[PDB]
Design an enzyme around this catalytic site. Structure first.
Site, PDB file in Angstrom:
ATOM      1  N   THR G   1      41.331  69.045  29.996  1.00 18.11           N
ATOM      2  CA  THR G   1      40.723  70.316  29.464  1.00 18.11           C
ATOM      3  C   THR G   1      41.147  71.669  30.083  1.00 18.11           C
ATOM      4  OG1 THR G   1      38.838  69.004  29.093  1.00 18.11           O
ATOM      5  CG2 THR G   1      38.415  71.344  29.145  1.00 18.11           C
ATOM      6  N   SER G   2      41.179  72.700  29.227  1.00 15.26           N
ATOM      7  CA  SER G   2      41.084  74.114  29.648  1.00 15.26           C
ATOM      8  C   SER G   2      39.799  74.736  29.075  1.00 15.26           C
ATOM      9  CB  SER G   2      42.286  74.917  29.148  1.00 15.26           C
ATOM     10  OG  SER G   2      43.498  74.216  29.353  1.00 15.26           O
ATOM     11  N   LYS G  33      33.821  71.046  23.039  1.00 17.05           N
ATOM     12  CA  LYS G  33      33.460  71.052  24.452  1.00 17.05           C
ATOM     13  C   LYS G  33      32.445  72.153  24.772  1.00 17.05           C
ATOM     14  CE  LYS G  33      38.159  69.464  25.383  1.00 17.05           C
ATOM     15  NZ  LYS G  33      39.318  69.537  26.314  1.00 17.05           N
ATOM     16  N   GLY G 128      38.741  73.233  34.394  1.00 17.78           N
ATOM     17  CA  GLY G 128      39.517  72.194  33.737  1.00 17.78           C
ATOM     18  C   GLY G 128      40.957  72.192  34.219  1.00 17.78           C
ATOM     19  N   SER G 129      41.663  71.100  33.939  1.00 14.70           N
ATOM     20  CA  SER G 129      43.038  70.912  34.401  1.00 14.70           C
ATOM     21  C   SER G 129      43.958  72.082  34.053  1.00 14.70           C
ATOM     22  CB  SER G 129      43.613  69.620  33.814  1.00 14.70           C
ATOM     23  OG  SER G 129      43.523  69.623  32.401  1.00 14.70           O
TER      24      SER G 129
END
Ligand SMILES: [K+]
Ligand SMILES: [Mg+2]
Ligand SMILES: [Mg+2]
Ligand SMILES: [Mg+2]
Ligand SMILES: [Mg+2]
Ligand SMILES: [Mg+2]
Lengths: 212, 204, 195, 222, 222, 125, 196, 233, 196, 195
Positions: G1-2, G33, G128-129
């Protein structure tokens, strides 16, 4: 496997089973576990099938080269030591072998050598080798005398393999008999356990644990 | 130390024309050492037959457990349990031990006394039901049994013919497995007679 | 622990059990009796993990003796064996299982028959004409397969047993210091002193 | 860590008759749960009336076949175009396999052909060179399914003569090529039903004194 | 397993293959992976076979009691919530991968549930080992405003992709259609594209082939 | 490594280096072997232009190869030591692998084989 | 996720991609999300899908029961409930949650809750990643008291870059606007945001 | 023993009536980081072969150099280097296949999955796969990585067996390849939108298409999807 | 490390921070990660300090021997020598190197060489642990054919952000300008770049 | 392998070595001679890893016999022991070391004295009045510490040795099948047949 060989008044008896396994999978029931090196020498096979088969036929070639070079049949001691010295060079590499080199020569008389893959080499009168060796010992030891007749000795060897074939899950198939005399080895047939068990049970009155 | 292959053994069941057959070997061993050649793996509660392979202590335990449960069933229901119902009981009981299971491969076989329909079923160790028209296999020679059954089997066999087929399926499968064999028993089951036959097989 | 044997003949059950107790590189005792009398006509031999063996044996002994007093009656060898099996079958899924293997030799007075049961630590019960636990079986089973007959006398059974001990003394790696032999028959349990 | 081995699935089967021999194998090639090819042959004509299959890890299987084919070529060059007998081929293959004893060819090898008396011959090898002549052998993923069926139908194991009280065995006899192909086809369709790595197609190579013939049959593609 | 779910005009359709495996062995050639939770709420299940059956039965049981308690037809979101909270509680150890679908007073619904407890919403979904083969078809042919017959075609085509291309999937296609205002129609073995061909030979044995030691009548009566 | 082919054929088919090695033998002190019905005797000449010798420590002309075989020689003394050493090593190696002492024929065959190798190896005489 | 949440003049806007994965397979390319725990208190979810859903469900329950007794909860209160669950169950959770809400007294507020279960109130938050790739960009471009249109562009450009570099991010850019006016849902498709 | 660093994802391909088509995206991934976007993973050898490579990019560039050198070496003392003794696809493959298996046998593999697509001198379509294990296989459709799981099922609907190849045109085949590339972009987390496609035809020869984009995508339905179960707004 | 190299109208500029670490200890806060392998061919070093130094030394030797025989090597040639060492010794190296040089024919050129030993020619390149945080920023701000002053500002702002977020980066920002005019060394201190 | 003992008395060195060769759960042989004559007045017993033992013993034997023939002279027990130690000291840092422990009993004819050397596989040499390898030492050393005197006769040494074997047969876990006893003195090496 189960294999044996013992010495007595009338020479040497050699008996083996014929089963090959891959884990619990019965791969074969007709494997030749005795190799005929020359008319006076025999080799038994237990452990890794390829290892035993490859190196014992290789041994046979070395024995042939000896008698070409020396104009004389190789001694049982020297033949066994070629094999034991070979496997000792591979010690730690993972070869798996339990073999018996049996034969007659003039200078030695009837002779049996135990040779295994960790380099052990032993002269002796009686040996049993393989996963069913203990079952074979139990019958063989409790009936062995030096003064057994050729007829009785052949049966005891056959009966000892049968004992192991029955109890050891990784032994079975059939019994291959051999008799070694001053005149050389003599083959005494392939005996399927399928028929041999019931024949022995009935005639001998043994194997009462089994539903008749 | 794989619980399901310490003792060894096999069970197979088949359907025929208005009949079912269930068969098992007699071996009980401890890995390589054969110990007993009298260890039967098929049990029955009324007319419902249950075969169980795998760890022998669990085989004995589950037999005792299902005898227990079917006895209480009969007392309260005032009738014998049917194969379809017993199948569900086996599944419930096994899934109850989901995360600490009995290491077994049970096989139900029998004829529904009301409908007359032949019924067979198999389970994994945690109860999943495997129903079949034709055959169910179980044990350390299950691969072998699958191969034998899948080729030898044909539908609507007569009781006497079905006996030959299931016997040959078991025998030849057992002879390719080190941990199976040492004798065999076959149950032929008709609507109101059951015949039990011991087979002659190689003892190695 | 280590060697326990059992032979059922015509009229009796004979149990042979090794006398050695070894810990490390020392044989601490050479006269150990690896058996308990559960009832007048039922004897149990045992082998396995140190401590576990005697603790389990005596626990079973207490339970059977309790039953005997409560009902003024002796349980059958079959009944005792099933009780023992269940206790081991419970044990194997406990936090710490009993690591004990047993042989139960008994004479059923109602049937007038000797009975021998082999039960391992998992709770695996079998009735046998002859039994053994541990590595002993790897020699004795094949030997008995050959020499055993179902109609043998107690004397014939003892000679058959001598043949087993001799083989074990020849081929076993460890010195087990001989065996204590006990006979279970219609008249109860007695020990052979000269073996 | 790099794993040099893989499993390409499939299964093979060799049967010997009186004056012929067949070597069959499915044409499916797989890795894990994917099909790589529905038709990738793994039974080969190696010359001198020798057919060969090395089933298991295909890269090793191809390498071995490639080397043996080359061994046949050089046998001709070095020994005045002499025909390589099936027994000699077998012994040669043992050395090819055992030569890599400590980094094995991950394959189960079967060869088929005719012996020097003109009779059908099947030899089978383990991964490191242990070999044995037989009437019958299945190899590969579904070997455990097929082999017991062959024991029963080719060698008549566990089959007794009716009414003889299980005292007289069903006598051994050679099977015709028509009967053998029936057993091969039934063996593979049965294996296809119960093994996921077996299917798509079946290719049989038949060996007689006249040469090497091929037959192909569809198998279930699921 | 391959399983799918597809929404359409006036409801939702789910489908599944019928193969059950134990390693490389096909244990069940015609198992039922479509599970009834309530009359108009059905569940397609992949993963551990006993888990998908047990968790679907348990929630189905509780849904029935809830429906009786509330005097209302059960909702898909209730089954969704109950399943996800149960599976989350067991931290993935209950290996159930479910596609939940159905119609209720609120409308038609399609969801998916992972063994660890996460849920998705979509017009089209696929789960199991053949989900990539199925999703490839769904992504290629799905559109907004599908009819009933179009959605069945798309769903069964997606399952077929799994049957043919995934070794974990095989045999038949089961379908269940849940339309608003109508009874849910369960179509067991909607397609059967893997019928076994005729065997080459009958292996019916001559009576007396098997050697017998003993016979006896078994008593099943009291 | 020194590679030169020192022992080679001449137009008349002689290997002169081998033949010149025989002249060295002809120069050496006389040695004789005679075998009886139950024994063999090895006799050896020792030249007497050397007085003030120490016969305790001076290398003896007859050498034991094993406890049952002996070797005497004629020719270059330094050369003989190399042959004797190789022979003695082969004697022990034979006992180790064959579990039997060498036959006299075998020991001779080995020593002769060594000598031959030095007639068609590069860089050696 | 971002994921990200950004406060501005009229309130706060939440933003997220729509990608869920198992390894390199995209299990869901249209995930949502952004997730309602109360009328005008929402959260952005990152980490384990099961964990963040289970947490959000529990929080929504807690705030619903709060509202029944004490009326509308503050954004801070909502963040505290998230924290309590994340902190006390830190050993068994993989959840990175951004909490965002609109009060009329407090206007827009953003609280970020990383893995450990710590709470951090910020003007804006990224997580998030994919957030790693836009720390530089977001720090350089964020201003306080932006307009709605400016804040939408800021989030759109930011997540566009996060998506561009992070393989674990992608799909559509979802956004949720929280103001006095109400709740507005925005969506932006690849064809628009990719060529920014 | 290696581990791959900069990696390329799926290579997909299929046979059609007159030749073969092959495609691969232009991405060089660095774990989850989509690091390099101008990476060409289809490499033509002559005018009759294209080698598509997935896996480690450093190893791909090494293989490029090997193929480049193979062309040079073949031209040496070869008057028919652009005619009868030109490099065939089958020669190029067998060479790579030999190298791949030798490298795995030395426990130091080239961490790649490779598909060699081309047309032989006699007009026959050539399409064969080889990977880091030295495993080789051929099929009417071939794909690596995710392509094996997602593209193959789609491409097999067009060409399911040998007899379907003559019935498949270049228009139909390319359409299927381009569709498969779109599906991979939807579903593979290490794919890019930009890709290259090559057609090797026995009549029209080698057509190399660069800078293609995935288009005609469906994303509109995303607006209707809210929450993960019960949420309505 | 945070490192980068950027081509522009008049040539190319290399940039780097000055931090070297063992764990969280800064072993050197004034490191020079910009390194001469030839008069107008330089490199940026990231990864193991020992590895990148040993490699750069070998390359400088190779190019010196090249120059003695064949005259000035191309930037591509220099990159090829770096690659050869990095690729063939990939199992024993942890080196991320950016190669940058100025030809008069080819003007400014940048080649990046990651861990595996692959080569990538780019308009500009970023690398090192801190590069992750400026992918978003650099992609949004880079233009081709920038002026010297613009390129200096681009690198200064970029590395400023990389330094701000990455703990493994810091100290001064060093830069090396490669043009036809010659070689210029620039340095920028915290007090300037931190408050950008 | 397993039990090897050595006792040096007034005029001789006595070596006792177990006869058993065990592999797994089977005693394969009960008459094994774990010794090699290195020279007429030097005897070496050995114990350790299977294969390694005999291979090492015979390799040493060959080397000493080669020396004897070359020099027409018998090496002293001290010289032989030092040669053996160095070979083992080389071995321990080889790719695959010899895992063999040895006792060397010899009579030095120049000194007219018996000598006993204990050398382990590491190449650790010590001269001792009495020695043992393996677990045997844990019983015999303390026993000999008590009963040994330096001026004992060969007969007294044999009785002292009987006392060691008896203790080992009582307290050792494994059955080692008795011992072969050999005496090394001024007249060379001879074997006691009745022990
Ligand atoms: K199922
Ligand atoms: Mg057996
Ligand atoms: Mg269970
Ligand atoms: Mg499939
Ligand atoms: Mg910093
Ligand atoms: Mg020491």
């Amino acid at each position: 496997t189960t294999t044996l060989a013992f010495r007595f008044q009338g020479g040497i008896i050699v008996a083996v089973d014929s089963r090959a396994t891959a884990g619990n999978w019965v791969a074969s029931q007709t494997v030749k576990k005795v190799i005929e090196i020359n008319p006076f020498l025999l080799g038994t096979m237990a452990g890794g099938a390829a290892d035993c088969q490859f190196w014992e036929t290789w041994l046979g070639s070395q024995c042939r080269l000896h008698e070409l070079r020396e104009k004389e049949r190789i001694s049982v001691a020297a033949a066994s030591k070629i094999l034991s010295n070979l496997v000792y060079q591979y010690k730690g590499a993972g070869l798996s072998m339990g073999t018996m080199i049996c034969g007659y020569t003039r200078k030695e008389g009837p002779t049996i050598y135990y040779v295994d893959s960790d380099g052990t080499r032993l002269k002796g009168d009686i040996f049993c080798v393989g996963s069913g060796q203990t079952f074979a010992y139990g019958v063989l030891d409790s009936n062995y005398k030096w003064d057994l007749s050729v007829e009785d000795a052949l049966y005891l060897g056959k009966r000892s393999i049968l004992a192991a074939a029955h109890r050891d899950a990784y032994s079975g198939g059939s019994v291959n008999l051999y008799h070694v005399t001053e005149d050389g080895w003599i083959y005494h047939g392939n005996h399927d356990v399928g028929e041999l068990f019931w024949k022995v049970k009935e005639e001998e009155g043994s194997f009462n644990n089994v539903i008749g | 130390s794989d619980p399901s292959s310490i003792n060894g053994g096999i069970v197979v069941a088949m359907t025929g024309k208005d009949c079912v057959a269930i068969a098992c070997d007699l071996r009980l061993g401890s890995q390589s050492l054969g110990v007993s050649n009298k260890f039967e793996k098929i049990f029955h509660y009324g007319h419902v037959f249950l075969g169980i392979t795998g760890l022998a202590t669990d085989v004995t335990t589950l037999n005792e457990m299902f005898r227990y449960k079917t006895n209480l069933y009969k007392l309260k229901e005032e009738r014998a349990i049917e194969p379809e119902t017993f199948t569900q009981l086996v599944s419930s009981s096994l899934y109850e031990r989901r995360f600490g299971p009995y290491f077994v491969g049970p096989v139900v076989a029998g004829i529904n006394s009301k409908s007359g329909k032949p019924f067979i079923a198999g389970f994994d160790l945690i109860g999943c039901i495997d129903e079949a028209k034709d055959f169910i296999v179980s044990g350390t020679a299950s691969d072998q049994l699958f191969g034998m059954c899948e080729s030898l089997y044909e539908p609507n066999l007569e009781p006497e013919d079905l006996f030959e087929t299931i016997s040959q399926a078991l025998l030849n499968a057992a002879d390719r497995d080190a941990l199976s064999g040492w004798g065999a028993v076959v149950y032929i089951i008709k609507k109101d007679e059951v015949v039990k036959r011991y087979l002659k097989m190689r003892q190695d | 622990m280590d060697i326990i044997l059992g032979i059922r003949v015509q009229d009796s059950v004979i149990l042979a059990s090794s006398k050695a107790v070894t810990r490390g590189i020392s044989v601490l005792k050479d006269s150990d009796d690896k058996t308990r009398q559960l009832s007048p006509h039922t004897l149990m031999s045992f082998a396995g993990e140190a401590g576990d063996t005697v603790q389990f044996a005596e626990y079973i002994q207490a339970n059977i003796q309790l039953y005997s007093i409560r009902e003024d009656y002796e349980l059958s060898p079959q009944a005792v064996s099933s009780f023992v099996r269940q206790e081991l079958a419970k044990s194997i899924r406990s936090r710490r299982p009993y690591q004990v293997n047993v042989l139960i030799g008994g004479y059923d007075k109602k049937k007038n028959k000797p009975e021998l049961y082999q039960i391992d630590y998992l709770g695996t019960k079998v009735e046998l004409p002859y039994g053994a636990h541990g590595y002993s079986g790897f020699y004795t089973f094949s030997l008995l397969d050959h020499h055993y007959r179902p109609d043998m006398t107690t004397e014939e059974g003892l000679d058959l047993l001598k043949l087993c001990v001799q083989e074990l003394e020849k081929r076993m790696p460890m010195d087990f210091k001989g065996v204590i032999v006990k006979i279970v028959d219609k008249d109860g349990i007695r020990q052979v002193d000269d073996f | 860590q790099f794993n040099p081995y893989g499993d390409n699935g499939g299964t093979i089967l060799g049967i010997a008759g009186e004056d012929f021999a067949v070597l069959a194998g499915d044409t499916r090639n797989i890795t894990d749960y994917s099909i790589n090819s529905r038709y990738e042959p793994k039974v080969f004509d190696c010359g001198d009336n020798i057919v060969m299959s090395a089933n298991g890890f295909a890269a090793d299987g191809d390498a071995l076949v490639k080397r043996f084919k080359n061994s046949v070529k050089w046998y001709h060059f070095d020994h005045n175009d002499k025909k390589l007998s099936i027994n000699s081929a077998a012994r040669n293959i043992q050395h090819l396999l055992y030569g890599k004893r400590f980094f094995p060819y991950y394959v189960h090898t079967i060869i088929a052909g005719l012996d020097e008396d003109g009779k059908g011959a099947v030899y089978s090898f383990d991964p490191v060179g242990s070999y044995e002549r037989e009437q019958c052998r299945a190899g590969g993923a579904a070997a455990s399914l097929i082999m017991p069926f062959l024991d029963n139908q080719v060698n008549f194991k566990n089959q007794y003569e009716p009414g003889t009280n299980g005292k007289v065995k069903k006598p051994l006899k050679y099977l015709s090529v028509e009967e053998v192909i029936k057993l091969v086809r039934d063996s593979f369709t049965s294996a296809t039903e119960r093994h996921i790595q077996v299917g798509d197609g079946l290719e049989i190579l038949i060996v007689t004194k006249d040469g090497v013939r091929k037959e192909f049959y569809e198998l279930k593609r699921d | 397993t391959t399983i799918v779910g597809v929404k359409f005009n006036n409801g939702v359709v789910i489908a599944a293959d019928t193969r059950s495996t134990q390693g490389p062995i096909v244990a069940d050639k015609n198992c039922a992976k479509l599970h009834r939770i309530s009359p108009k709420i059905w569940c397609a299940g992949a993963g551990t076979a006993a888990d998908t059956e047990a968790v679907t039965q348990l929630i189905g049981s509780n849904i029935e009691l809830h429906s009786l308690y509330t005097s209302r037809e059960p909702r898909v979101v209730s089954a969704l919530q109950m399943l996800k909270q149960h599976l989350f509680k067991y931290q993935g150890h209950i290996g159930a991968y479910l596609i939940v679908a159905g119609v209720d007073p609120t409308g038609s619904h399609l969801f998916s549930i992972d063994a660890h407890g996460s849920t998705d919403v979509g017009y089209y979904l696929s789960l199991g080992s053949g989900s990539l083969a199925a999703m490839a078809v769904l992504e290629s042919h799905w559109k907004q405003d599908l009819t009933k017959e179009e959605a069945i075609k798309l769903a069964s085509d997606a399952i077929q992709a799994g049957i043919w291309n995934d070794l974990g999937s095989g045999s038949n296609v089961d379908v269940c259609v849940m339309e608003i205002g109508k009874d849910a129609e369960y179509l067991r073995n909607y397609l059967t594209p893997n019928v076994r061909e005729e065997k080459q030979k009958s292996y019916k044995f001559p009576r007396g082939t098997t050697a017998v030691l003993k016979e006896s009548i078994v008593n099943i009566c009291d | 490594g020194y590679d030169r082919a020192l022992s080679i054929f001449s137009p008349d088919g002689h290997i002169f280096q081998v033949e010149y090695a025989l002249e060295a033998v002809k120069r050496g002190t006389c040695a004789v072997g005679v075998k009886g019905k139950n024994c063999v005797v090895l006799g050896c000449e020792r030249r007497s232009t050397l007085k003030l010798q120490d016969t305790r420590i001076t290398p003896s002309k007859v050498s034991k190869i094993d406890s049952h075989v002996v070797l005497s020689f004629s020719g270059l003394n330094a050369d003989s030591r190399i042959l004797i050493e190789k022979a003695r090593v082969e004697a022990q190696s034979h006992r180790l692998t064959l579990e039997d002492p060498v036959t006299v024929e075998y020991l001779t065959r080995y020593v002769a084989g060594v000598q031959q190798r030095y007639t068609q190896s590069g860089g050696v005489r | 996720t971002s994921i990200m949440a950004v406060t501005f003049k009229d309130g706060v806007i939440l933003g997220a991609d729509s990608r869920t994965t198992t390894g390199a397979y995209i299990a869901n390319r249209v995930t949502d999300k952004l997730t309602r725990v109360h009328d005008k208190i929402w959260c952005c979810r990152s980490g384990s899908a099961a964990d963040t859903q289970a947490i959000a469900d529990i929080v929504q329950y807690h705030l619903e029961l709060y509202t029944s007794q004490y009326g509308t909860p503050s954004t801070e209160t909502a963040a505290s409930v998230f924290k309590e669950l994340c902190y006390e169950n830190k050993d068994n959770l993989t959840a990175g949650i951004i909490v965002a809400g609109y009060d009329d007294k407090n206007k827009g507020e953003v609280y970020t809750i990383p893995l450990g279960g710590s709470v951090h109130k910020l003007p804006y938050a990224i997580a998030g990643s994919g957030s790693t790739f836009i720390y530089g960009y977001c720090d350089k471009n964020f201003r306080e008291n932006m307009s709605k249109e400016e804040t939408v562009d800021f989030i759109k450009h930011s997540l566009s870059q996060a998506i561009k570099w992070d393989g674990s991010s992608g799909g559509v850019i979802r956004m949720v606007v929280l103001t006095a006016a109400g709740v507005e849902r925005l969506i932006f498709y690849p064809d628009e945001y990719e060529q920014l | 023993t290696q581990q791959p660093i900069v990696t390329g994802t799926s290579v997909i391909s299929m046979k059609y009536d007159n030749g073969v088509i092959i495609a691969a995206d232009n991405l060089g991934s660095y774990g989850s980081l989509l690091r390099f976007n101008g990476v060409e993973r289809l490499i033509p050898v002559g005018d009759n072969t294209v080698v598509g490579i997935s896996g480690d990019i450093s190893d791909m560039q090494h293989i490029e150099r090997l193929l480049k050198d193979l062309v040079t070496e073949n031209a040496y003392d070869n008057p028919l280097a652009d005619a009868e003794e030109a490099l065939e696809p089958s020669y190029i493959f067998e060479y790579l296949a030999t190298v791949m298996y030798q490298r795995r046998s030395k426990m130091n593999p080239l961490w790649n999955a490779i598909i060699v697509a081309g047309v032989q001198s006699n007009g026959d379509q050539f399409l064969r796969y080889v990977n880091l294990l030295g495993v080789t296989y051929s099929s009417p459709t071939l794909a690596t990585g995710f392509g094996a799981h997602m593209a193959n099922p789609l491409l097999r609907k067009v060409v399911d067996r040998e007899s379907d190849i003559p019935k498949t045109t270049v228009q139909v085949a390319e359409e299927a390849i381009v569709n498969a590339m779109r599906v991979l972009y939807y579903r593979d987390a290490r794919s890019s939108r930009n890709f290259s496609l090559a057609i090797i035809d026995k009549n029209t020869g080698l057509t190399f298409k660069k800078n293609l984009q995935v288009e005609n995508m469906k994303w509109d339905f995303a607006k209707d999807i809210k929450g993960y179960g019960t949420q309505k707004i």
